[PDB]
Tab-separated table of C-alpha atoms and ligand atoms in Angstrom:
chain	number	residue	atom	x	y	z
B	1	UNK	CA	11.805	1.865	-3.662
B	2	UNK	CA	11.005	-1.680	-4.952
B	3	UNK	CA	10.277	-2.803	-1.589
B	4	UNK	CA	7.475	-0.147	-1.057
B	5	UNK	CA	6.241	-0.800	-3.994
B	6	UNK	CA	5.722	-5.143	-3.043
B	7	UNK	CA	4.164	-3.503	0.609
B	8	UNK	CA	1.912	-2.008	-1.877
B	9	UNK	CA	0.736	-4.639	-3.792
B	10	UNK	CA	0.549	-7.136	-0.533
B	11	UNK	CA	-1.742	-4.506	0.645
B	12	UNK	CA	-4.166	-4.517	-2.332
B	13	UNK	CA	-4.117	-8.639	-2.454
B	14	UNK	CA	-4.885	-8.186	1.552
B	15	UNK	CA	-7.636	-5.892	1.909
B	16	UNK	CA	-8.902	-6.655	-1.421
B	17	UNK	CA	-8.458	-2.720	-2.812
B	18	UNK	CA	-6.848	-0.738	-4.794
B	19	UNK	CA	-3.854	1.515	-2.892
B	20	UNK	CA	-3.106	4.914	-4.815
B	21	UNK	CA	1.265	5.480	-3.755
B	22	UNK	CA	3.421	8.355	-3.855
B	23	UNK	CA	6.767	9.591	-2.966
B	24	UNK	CA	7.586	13.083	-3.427
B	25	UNK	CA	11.106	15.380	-2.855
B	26	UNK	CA	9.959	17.943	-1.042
B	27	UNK	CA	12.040	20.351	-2.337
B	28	UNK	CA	12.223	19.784	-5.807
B	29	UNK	CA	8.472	17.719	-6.307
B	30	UNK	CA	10.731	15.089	-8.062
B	31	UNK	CA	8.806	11.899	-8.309
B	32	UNK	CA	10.769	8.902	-6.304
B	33	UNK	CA	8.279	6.002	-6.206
B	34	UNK	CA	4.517	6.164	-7.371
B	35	UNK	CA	1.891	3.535	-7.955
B	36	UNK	CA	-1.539	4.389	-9.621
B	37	UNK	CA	-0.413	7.974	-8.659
B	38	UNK	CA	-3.196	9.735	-11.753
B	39	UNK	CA	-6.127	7.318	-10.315
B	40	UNK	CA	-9.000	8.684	-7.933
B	41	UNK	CA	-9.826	7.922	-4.418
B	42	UNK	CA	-11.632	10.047	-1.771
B	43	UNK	CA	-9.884	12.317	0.189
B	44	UNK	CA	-12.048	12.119	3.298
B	45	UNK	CA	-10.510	14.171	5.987
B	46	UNK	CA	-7.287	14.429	4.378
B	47	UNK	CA	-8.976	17.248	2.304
B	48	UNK	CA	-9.294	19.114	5.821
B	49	UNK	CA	-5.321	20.069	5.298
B	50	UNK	CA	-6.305	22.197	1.579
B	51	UNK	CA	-9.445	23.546	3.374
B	52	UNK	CA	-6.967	25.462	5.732
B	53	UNK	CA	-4.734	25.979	3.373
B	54	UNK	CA	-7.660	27.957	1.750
B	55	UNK	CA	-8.651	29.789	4.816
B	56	UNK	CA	-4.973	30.728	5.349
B	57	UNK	CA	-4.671	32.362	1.627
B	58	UNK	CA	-7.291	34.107	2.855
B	59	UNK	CA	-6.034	35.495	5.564
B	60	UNK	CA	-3.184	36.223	4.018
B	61	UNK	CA	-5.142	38.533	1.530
B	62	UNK	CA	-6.789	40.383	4.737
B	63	UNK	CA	-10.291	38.323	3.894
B	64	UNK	CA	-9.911	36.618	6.862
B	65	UNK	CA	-9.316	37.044	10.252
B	66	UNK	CA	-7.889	33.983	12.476
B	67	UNK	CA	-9.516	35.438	15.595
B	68	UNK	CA	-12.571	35.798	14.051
B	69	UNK	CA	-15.405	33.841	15.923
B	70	UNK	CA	-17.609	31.506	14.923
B	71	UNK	CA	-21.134	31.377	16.604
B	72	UNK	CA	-23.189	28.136	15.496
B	73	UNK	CA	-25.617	25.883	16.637
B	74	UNK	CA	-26.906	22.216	17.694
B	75	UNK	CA	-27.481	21.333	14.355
B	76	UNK	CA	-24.314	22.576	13.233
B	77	UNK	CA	-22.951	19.162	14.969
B	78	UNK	CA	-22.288	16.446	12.929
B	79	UNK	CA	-20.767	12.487	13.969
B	80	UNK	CA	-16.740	12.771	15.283
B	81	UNK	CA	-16.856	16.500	16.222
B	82	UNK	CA	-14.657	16.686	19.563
B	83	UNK	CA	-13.894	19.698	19.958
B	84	UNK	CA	-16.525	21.574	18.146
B	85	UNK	CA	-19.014	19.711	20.286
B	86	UNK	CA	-18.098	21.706	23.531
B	87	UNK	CA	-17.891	25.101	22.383
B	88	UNK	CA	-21.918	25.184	21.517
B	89	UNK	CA	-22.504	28.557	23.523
B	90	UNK	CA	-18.758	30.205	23.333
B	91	UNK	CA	-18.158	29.330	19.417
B	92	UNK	CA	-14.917	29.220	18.201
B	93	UNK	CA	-12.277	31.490	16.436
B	94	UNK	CA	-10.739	30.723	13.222
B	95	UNK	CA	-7.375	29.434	14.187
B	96	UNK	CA	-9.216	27.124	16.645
B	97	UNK	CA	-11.186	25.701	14.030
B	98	UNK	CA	-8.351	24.807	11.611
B	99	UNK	CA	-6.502	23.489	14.583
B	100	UNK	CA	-9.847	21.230	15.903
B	101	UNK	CA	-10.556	20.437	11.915
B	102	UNK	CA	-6.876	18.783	11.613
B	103	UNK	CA	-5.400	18.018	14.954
B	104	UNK	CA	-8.755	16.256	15.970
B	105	UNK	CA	-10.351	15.715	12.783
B	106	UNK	CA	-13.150	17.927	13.848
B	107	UNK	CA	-15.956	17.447	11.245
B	108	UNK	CA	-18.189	20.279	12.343
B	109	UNK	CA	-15.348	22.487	12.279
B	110	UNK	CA	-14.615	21.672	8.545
B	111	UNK	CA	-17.406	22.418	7.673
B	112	UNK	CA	-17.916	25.847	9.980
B	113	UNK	CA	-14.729	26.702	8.064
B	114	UNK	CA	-16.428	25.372	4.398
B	115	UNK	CA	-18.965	27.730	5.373
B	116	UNK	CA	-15.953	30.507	6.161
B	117	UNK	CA	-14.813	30.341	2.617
B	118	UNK	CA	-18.076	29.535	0.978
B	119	UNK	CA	-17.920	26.146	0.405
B	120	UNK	CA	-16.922	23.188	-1.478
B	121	UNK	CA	-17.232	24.602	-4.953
B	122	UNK	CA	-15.192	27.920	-3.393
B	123	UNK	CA	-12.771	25.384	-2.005
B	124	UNK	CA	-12.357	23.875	-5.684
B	125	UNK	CA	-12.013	26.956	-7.411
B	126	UNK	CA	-8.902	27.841	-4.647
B	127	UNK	CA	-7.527	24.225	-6.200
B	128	UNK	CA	-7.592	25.266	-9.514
B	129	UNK	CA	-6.644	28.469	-9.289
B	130	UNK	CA	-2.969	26.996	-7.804
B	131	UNK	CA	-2.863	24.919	-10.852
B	132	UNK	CA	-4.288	21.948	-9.125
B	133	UNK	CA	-6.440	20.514	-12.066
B	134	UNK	CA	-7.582	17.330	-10.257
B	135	UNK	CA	-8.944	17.539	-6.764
B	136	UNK	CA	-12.597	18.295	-5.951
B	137	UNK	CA	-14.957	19.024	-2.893
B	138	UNK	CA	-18.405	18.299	-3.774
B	139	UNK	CA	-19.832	17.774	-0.099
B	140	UNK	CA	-19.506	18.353	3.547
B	141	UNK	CA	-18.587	16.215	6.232
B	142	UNK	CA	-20.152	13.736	7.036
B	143	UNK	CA	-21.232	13.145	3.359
B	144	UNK	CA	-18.333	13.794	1.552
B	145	UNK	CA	-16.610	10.462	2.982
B	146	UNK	CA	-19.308	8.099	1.239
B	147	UNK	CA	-16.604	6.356	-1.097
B	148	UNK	CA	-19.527	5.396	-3.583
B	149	UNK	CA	-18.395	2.530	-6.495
B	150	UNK	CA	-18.355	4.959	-9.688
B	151	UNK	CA	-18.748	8.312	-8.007
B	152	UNK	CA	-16.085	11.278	-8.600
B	153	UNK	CA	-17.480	13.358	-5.945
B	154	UNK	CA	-14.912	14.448	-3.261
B	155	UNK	CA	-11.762	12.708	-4.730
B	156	UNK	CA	-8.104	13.665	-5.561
B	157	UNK	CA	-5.126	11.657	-7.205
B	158	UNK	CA	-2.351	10.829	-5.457
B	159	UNK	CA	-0.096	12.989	-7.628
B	160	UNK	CA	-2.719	15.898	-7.280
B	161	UNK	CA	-2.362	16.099	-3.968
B	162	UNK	CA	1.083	15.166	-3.012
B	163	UNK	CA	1.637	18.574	-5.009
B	164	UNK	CA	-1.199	20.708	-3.715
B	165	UNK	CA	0.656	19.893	0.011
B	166	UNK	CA	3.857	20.904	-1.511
B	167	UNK	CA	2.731	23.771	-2.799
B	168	UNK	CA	1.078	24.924	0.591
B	169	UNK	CA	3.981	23.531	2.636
B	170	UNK	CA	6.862	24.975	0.710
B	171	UNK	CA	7.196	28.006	-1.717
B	172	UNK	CA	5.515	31.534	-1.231
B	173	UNK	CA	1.907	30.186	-2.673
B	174	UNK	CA	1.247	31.060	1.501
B	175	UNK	CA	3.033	33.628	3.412
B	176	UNK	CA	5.948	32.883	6.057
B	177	UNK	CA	3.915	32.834	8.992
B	178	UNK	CA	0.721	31.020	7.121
B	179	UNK	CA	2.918	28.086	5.714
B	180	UNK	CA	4.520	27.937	9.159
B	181	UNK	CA	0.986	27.950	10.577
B	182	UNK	CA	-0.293	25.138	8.467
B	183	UNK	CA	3.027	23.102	9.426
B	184	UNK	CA	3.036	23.743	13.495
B	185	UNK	CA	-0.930	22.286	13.116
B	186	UNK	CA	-0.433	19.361	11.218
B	187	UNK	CA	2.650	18.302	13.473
B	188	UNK	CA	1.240	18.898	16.775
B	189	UNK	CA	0.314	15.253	18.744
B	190	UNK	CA	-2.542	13.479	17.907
B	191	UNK	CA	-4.354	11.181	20.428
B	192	UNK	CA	-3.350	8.143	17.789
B	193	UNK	CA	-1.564	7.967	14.576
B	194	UNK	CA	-1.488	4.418	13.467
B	195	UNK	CA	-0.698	4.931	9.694
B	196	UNK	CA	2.708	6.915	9.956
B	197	UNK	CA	3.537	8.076	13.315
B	198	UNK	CA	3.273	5.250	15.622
B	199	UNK	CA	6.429	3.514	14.522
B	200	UNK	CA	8.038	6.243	13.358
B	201	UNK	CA	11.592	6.900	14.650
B	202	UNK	CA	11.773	9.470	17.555
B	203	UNK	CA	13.424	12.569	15.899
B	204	UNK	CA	11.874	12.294	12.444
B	205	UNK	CA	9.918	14.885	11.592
B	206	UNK	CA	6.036	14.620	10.483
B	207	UNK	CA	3.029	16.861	9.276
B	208	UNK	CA	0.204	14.582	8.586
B	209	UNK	CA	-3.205	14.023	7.937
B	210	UNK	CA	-5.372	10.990	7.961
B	211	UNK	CA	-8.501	10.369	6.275
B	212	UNK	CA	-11.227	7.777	7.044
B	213	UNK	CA	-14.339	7.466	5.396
B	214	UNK	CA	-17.375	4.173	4.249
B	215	UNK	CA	-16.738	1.656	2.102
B	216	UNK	CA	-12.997	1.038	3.076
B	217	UNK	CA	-11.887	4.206	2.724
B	218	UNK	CA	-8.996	5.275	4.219
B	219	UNK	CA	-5.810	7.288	3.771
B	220	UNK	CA	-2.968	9.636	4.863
B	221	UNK	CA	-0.791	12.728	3.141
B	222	UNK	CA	2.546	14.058	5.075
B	223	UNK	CA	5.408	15.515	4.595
B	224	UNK	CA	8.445	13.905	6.686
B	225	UNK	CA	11.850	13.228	7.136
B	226	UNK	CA	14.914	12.547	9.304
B	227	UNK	CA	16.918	14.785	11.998
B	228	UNK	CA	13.534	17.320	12.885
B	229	UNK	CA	13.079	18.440	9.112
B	230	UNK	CA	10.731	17.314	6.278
B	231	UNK	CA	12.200	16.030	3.038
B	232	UNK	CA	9.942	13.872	1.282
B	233	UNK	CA	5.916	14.076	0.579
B	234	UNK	CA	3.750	10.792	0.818
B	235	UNK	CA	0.354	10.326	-0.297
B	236	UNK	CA	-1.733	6.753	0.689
B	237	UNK	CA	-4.814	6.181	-0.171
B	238	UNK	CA	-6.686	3.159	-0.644
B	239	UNK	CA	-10.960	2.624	-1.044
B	240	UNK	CA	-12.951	-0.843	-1.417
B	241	UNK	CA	-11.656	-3.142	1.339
B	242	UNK	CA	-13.922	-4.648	3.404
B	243	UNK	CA	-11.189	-5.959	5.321
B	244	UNK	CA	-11.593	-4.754	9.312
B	245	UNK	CA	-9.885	-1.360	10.524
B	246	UNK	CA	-7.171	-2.850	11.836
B	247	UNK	CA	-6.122	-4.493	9.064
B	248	UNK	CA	-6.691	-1.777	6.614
B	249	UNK	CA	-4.364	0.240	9.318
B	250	UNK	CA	-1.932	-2.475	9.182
B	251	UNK	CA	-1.763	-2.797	5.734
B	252	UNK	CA	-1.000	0.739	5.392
B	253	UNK	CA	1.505	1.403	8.636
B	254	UNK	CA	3.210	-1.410	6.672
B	255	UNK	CA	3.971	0.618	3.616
B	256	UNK	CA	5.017	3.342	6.089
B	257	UNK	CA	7.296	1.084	7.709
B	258	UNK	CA	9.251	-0.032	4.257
B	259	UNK	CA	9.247	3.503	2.736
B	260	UNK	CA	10.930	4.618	6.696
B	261	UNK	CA	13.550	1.421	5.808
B	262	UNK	CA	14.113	2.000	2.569
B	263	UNK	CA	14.869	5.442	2.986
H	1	LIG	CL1	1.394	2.463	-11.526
H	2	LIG	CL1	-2.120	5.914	-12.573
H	3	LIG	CL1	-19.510	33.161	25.685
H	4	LIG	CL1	-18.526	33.022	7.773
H	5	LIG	CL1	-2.619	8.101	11.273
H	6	LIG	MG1	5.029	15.622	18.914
C-alpha cells in the first residue's frame, strides 16, 4: 500500500540506509507491495529459518534424525548463544537445536546444525536446488553478520526470500508434519519482538524471524495475518544505518505498523 511504501522511504531518510520491502499472498506468492525487492542485504539470523528448513528436508528424506544428539564443546560457543551455552556436557538433540537456533537466536546452535547438514555451501546448494537462484551462506555465525560495504557474502533479496519462506511454509516442498514443525517454532514467544510482534493485534497470527548483524544491519521475514491464520509474507531488511538500535527498531516496527493498518 502507498502508505507502506512513504514508512519506507521515511525510514531510509531516518537511519540513513537503504530498506529492501516486500509483501507477499501467501497463498498464491502474488506480489502486493515491494520496494528494492531484487537488491541484496544480509540475512543475518533470518537465514536461521532456511537452515531448518534444510535440516527438516532432511529429515524428511530419513538423513536426519530430530532426536539425534549433538555432543560439542567450549569452543563450539560463540557471542548470543543462550541456550546452547548450558547444555556444554548434555549436548543437544536436533529439534532442540532448530528450536534454540530460531526461538532464541541461538548462534552456536546454527552453526552445530550448519555442521549437521555440512555447511554453508550444503545450505546453498538446498537453495538452489528449490529454485531459489539468489540467496547464499558463505559463513557461520558470528561472521556471517559482518554487513561489509561491497561484499555479497551471506545475502538474499527480498523477493528471494519472501519465496524461499513460502515455499517452506506452504506447499509439499516439506512434509505435513515438517512444514507444521517449522511453523509451531517460528510462532512460539520470544522474550522480545520489537519489529512485528510487539504492536501487533492480539489474535493475529505470526511466524517470524529477526535478523541483527554490524554495520546497521538488521531485518525480519514472517508470514502473518488476521483471525489465528497467516495470509501474507513480509520481508524487511535494511543495512548501513548508523542510526542507534532503537531507532533502526523504530523505523522498522513503523513499517509494520502501516502495512498492519493498511491491511
Ligand atoms: Cl523499487
Ligand atoms: Cl530492486
Ligand atoms: Cl549427560
Ligand atoms: Cl553431524
Ligand atoms: Cl522482532
Ligand atoms: Mg504466543
Amino acid at each position: 500500500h502507498p502508505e507502506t511504501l512513504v514508512k519506507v522511504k521515511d525510514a531510509e531518510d531516518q537511519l540513513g540506509a537503504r530498506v529492501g520491502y516486500i509483501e507477499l499472498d501467501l497463498n498464491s506468492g502474488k506480489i502486493l507491495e515491494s520496494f528494492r525487492p531484487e537488491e541484496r542485504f544480509p540475512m543475518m539470523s533470518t537465514f536461521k529459518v532456511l537452515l531448518c528448513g534444510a535440516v527438516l528436508s532432511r529429515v524428511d528424506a530419513g538423513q536426519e534424525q530430530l532426536g539425534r544428539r549433538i555432543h560439542y564443546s567450549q569452543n563450539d560457543l560463540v557471542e548470543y548463544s543462550p541456550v546452547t551455552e548450558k547444555h556444554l556436557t548434555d549436548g543437544m538433540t536436533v529439534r532442540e537445536l532448530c528450536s534454540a537456533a530460531i526461538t532464541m537466536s541461538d548462534n552456536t546452535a546454527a552453526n552445530l546444525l550448519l555442521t549437521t547438514i555440512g555447511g554453508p555451501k550444503e545450505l546453498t546448494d538446498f537453495l538452489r536446488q528449490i529454485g531459489d537462484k539468489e540467496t547464499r551462506l558463505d559463513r557461520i555465525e558470528p561472521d556471517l553478520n559482518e554487513g561489509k560495504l561491497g561484499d555479497l557474502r551471506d545475502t538474499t533479496t527480498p523477493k528471494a526470500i519472501a519465496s524461499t519462506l513460502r515455499k517452506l511454509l506452504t506447499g509439499e516442498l516439506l512434509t505435513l508434519a515438517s512444514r507444521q514443525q517449522l511453523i509451531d517454532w517460528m510462532e512460539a514467544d520470544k522474550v522480545a519482538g520489537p519489529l512485528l510482534r510487539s504492536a501487533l493485534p492480539a489474535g493475529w497470527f505470526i511466524a517470524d524471524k529477526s535478523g541483527a548483524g554490524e554495520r546497521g544491519s538488521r531485518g525480519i521475514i514472517a508470514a502473518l495475518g488476521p483471525d489465528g491464520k497467516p495470509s501474507r509474507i513480509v520481508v524487511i531488511y535494511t543495512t548501513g544505518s548508523q542510526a542507534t538500535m532503537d531507532e533502526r527498531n523504530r523505523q522498522i516496527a513503523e513499517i509494520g505498523a502501516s502495512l498492519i493498518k493498511h491491511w
